[PDB]
Swiss-Prot record:
It is found in: Mitochondrion matrix. GO terms for cellular component: extracellular space; mitochondrial matrix; mitochondrion. Disulfide bonds: none annotated. Formation of iron-sulfur complexes, cyanide detoxification or modification of sulfur-containing enzymes. Other thiol compounds, besides cyanide, can act as sulfur ion acceptors. Also has weak mercaptopyruvate sulfurtransferase (MST) activity. Together with MRPL18, acts as a mitochondrial import factor for the cytosolic 5S rRNA. Only the nascent unfolded cytoplasmic form is able to bind to the 5S rRNA. Keywords: Acetylation, Glycoprotein, Mitochondrion, Phosphoprotein, Repeat, RNA-binding, Transferase. The modification Phosphoserine is found at residue 34. This is Thiosulfate sulfurtransferase. Monomer. It comes from Homo sapiens. Residues 140-155 are annotated as: Hinge.
């Protein structure tokens, strides 16, 4: 029995405009951008949803690791969403002011889920549409009394390098690469990386995340989504893993899949940066280099 995965700006607005925000309702800006482009922390601090805290993905992740976007310990998470005054009784509303309409927020929506928390929704049309209707923004510091978070890892949403390599032969799981086509193919390079070829894993079907989002920034009608999948010969009845580069825009398929009525899309968090580096070259392909 799936909870609200999306909420409207109108809904969030009316909620904000009613001091519903607090230990019952907590808002997060997950915004992150490639170094030298934008700065979310800054942009957050300048304007954010009245009573919004900034979710920093560099701080809530497994830093010991040598791969991009690894989950922290249930501990590292619980301690963090703790200090953002989020218990397990609260409802979490995640946004980013990414241009497209969303990019990281679904990473976070997921993280929150994969840690056994089912009242989380992405704010639909991102900060983008929040502004596009001038919904009150503030520079005023959001300062939530910290809360205790029991954090329980649901494993079914998490696929590891080891499990993906198995599925390479098993074929029991459909494998979707949310990365932009240019790179699923090997045409384009991989950005913010050293000796990291582009190319997808043997069997990956490419469903770029851009294609889940109307021009206006909103997610698409589930009919449009349900097409999008079918049309990619991707069956929602059947077990489905989402890759990325780092395991972030993969969640975009997760959110999609979920909205359509499949809450059992797992995420390869290693994704391509892990795969590329750990896997034999034969388990992955690239138009160009072979």
């Amino acid at each position: 029995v799936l909870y609200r995965a999306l909420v409207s700006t109108k809904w969030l607005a009316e909620s904000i405009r009613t001091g519903k925000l607090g230990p019952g309702l907590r808002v997060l800006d997950a915004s992150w951008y490639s170094p030298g482009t934008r700065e979310a922390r800054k942009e957050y601090l300048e304007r954010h949803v009245p009573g919004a805290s900034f979710f920093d993905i560099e701080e809530c992740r497994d830093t010991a690791s040598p791969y991009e976007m690894m989950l922290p310990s249930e501990a590292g998470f619980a301690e963090y969403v703790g200090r953002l005054g989020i218990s397990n009784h609260t409802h979490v509303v995640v946004y980013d002011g990414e241009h497209l309409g969303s990019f990281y927020a679904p990473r976070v929506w997921w993280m929150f889920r994969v840690f056994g928390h089912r009242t989380v929704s992405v704010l639909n049309g991102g900060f983008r549409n929040w502004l596009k209707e001038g919904h009150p923004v503030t520079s005023e510091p959001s300062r939530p009394e910290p809360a205790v978070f029991k954090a329980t890892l649901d494993r079914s949403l998490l696929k590891t390098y080891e499990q993906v390599l198995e599925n390479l032969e098993s074929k029991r799981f459909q494998l979707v690469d949310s990365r932009s086509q240019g790179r699923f193919l090997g045409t384009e390079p991989e950005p913010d990386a050293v000796g990291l070829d582009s190319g997808h894993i043997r069997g990956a079907v490419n469903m770029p995340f851009m294609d889940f989002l109307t021009e206006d920034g909103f997610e698409k009608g589930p009919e449009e989504l349900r097409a999008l999948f079918q049309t990619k010969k991707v069956d929602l009845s059947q077990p489905l893993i989402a890759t990325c580069r780092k395991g972030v825009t993969a969640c975009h398929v997760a959110l999609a899949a979920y909205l359509c009525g499949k809450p059992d899309v797992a995420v390869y968090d290693g994704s391509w940066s892990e795969w590329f580096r750990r896997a034999p070259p034969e388990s992955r392909v690239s138009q160009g280099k072979s």
